Amino acid sequence: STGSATTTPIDSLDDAYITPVQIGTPAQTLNLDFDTGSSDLWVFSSETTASEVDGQTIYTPSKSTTAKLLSGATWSISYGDGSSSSGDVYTDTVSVGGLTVTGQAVESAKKVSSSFTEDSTIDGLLGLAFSTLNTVSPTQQKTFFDNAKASLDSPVFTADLGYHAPGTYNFGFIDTTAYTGSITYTAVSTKQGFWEWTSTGYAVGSGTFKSTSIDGIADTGTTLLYLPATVVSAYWAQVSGAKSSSSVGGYVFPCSATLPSFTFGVGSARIVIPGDYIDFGPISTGSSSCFGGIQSSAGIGINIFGDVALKAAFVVFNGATTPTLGFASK
Ligand SMILES: NCc1ccc(C(F)(F)F)cc1
Ligand SMILES: NCc1ccc(C(F)(F)F)cc1
DSSP states (O other), X not given: OOEEEEEEESSTTOXXXXXXXXXXXXXXEEEEEEETTOOOEXXXXXXXXXXXXXXXXXXXGGGOTTOEEEEEEEEEEXXXXXXXXXEEEEEEEEEETTEEEEEEEEEEEEEEOXXXXXXXXXXXXXXXXXXXXXXXXXXXXOOXXXXXXXXXXXXXXXEEOOSSSOEEEEESOOOTTSSSSOOEEEEOBOTTSSOEEEEEEEEETXXXXXXEEEEEEEXXXXXXXXXXXXXXXXXXXXXXXXXXXXXXXXXXXXXXXOOOOEEEEETTEEEEEOGGGGEEEESSTTOSEEEESEEEOTTTSSEEEOHHHHTTEEEEEEOSSSOEEEEEEO
């Protein structure tokens, strides 16, 4: 079987992408943030503390004829940005763009952090990292992808994120019309539970390509590109008036500047991020200082190829027994 769903930016900056997902019988449609950096499928629900819900669509297990409470199971998750949520666990039928999984763990939020409450457009997350990171206790649960794998024509999913525009998540097949040239595949380490790989280097604008190994994760659930301090300093040094601001928490630049592109290596191939993708607009309404889309990973502990990088490519998540990541220009 296969599935295909359109994913849409939540705002004018592409801060995140939501994808409609059908849960329960009859279907309850929720817009979830597909996150290859985590492994929990959790939703705002009728069980979520009322004061912590602000416009989200909620899942109501009591109205689903296929929902079953998973007795004794709980979940609690903390994201690298300080966000967190927790609750209990149902199993239910979950469908993405025609692809159906029965008995998927649906984690019902009883408590959500403030960052989630304030994001009215995101009804929950759909984790797509490896199932070893799932937080359900005492019995770990599988991701939507792991549960679908056997039924898929090919054990793959692909992310085709748009720049200020809708894109596509496909499950089970590779759309050969969606990219140009060839797909370059590169090895993945699952030892930390992430889609972790090694980039072969970078270039700034029209500069010389620097061959150097950058280990990092492919994370659709992170907005920006987080890279080592040396690389990030080399990029922003090419932007007149750019500086790191401690009060803002990253590199900022004059909104009147033009940004150079950024190239990253995948094996022998190159993915080019246009400079406009790196502009995240004024730091506050009316400001002439703009926030940069390439930031240092020094405080984080791991390099993150977030949406800024991924939306410049067609990306294959190959969940074969030896997993790989594929990148193609588009
Ligand atoms: N998008 C999920 C996610 C968020 C943060 C991290 C970090 F910070 F631990 F690298 C990994 C994955
Ligand atoms: N990386 C997972 C993640 C995704 C979105 C959010 C937000 F936007 F809701 F804060 C936090 C954490």
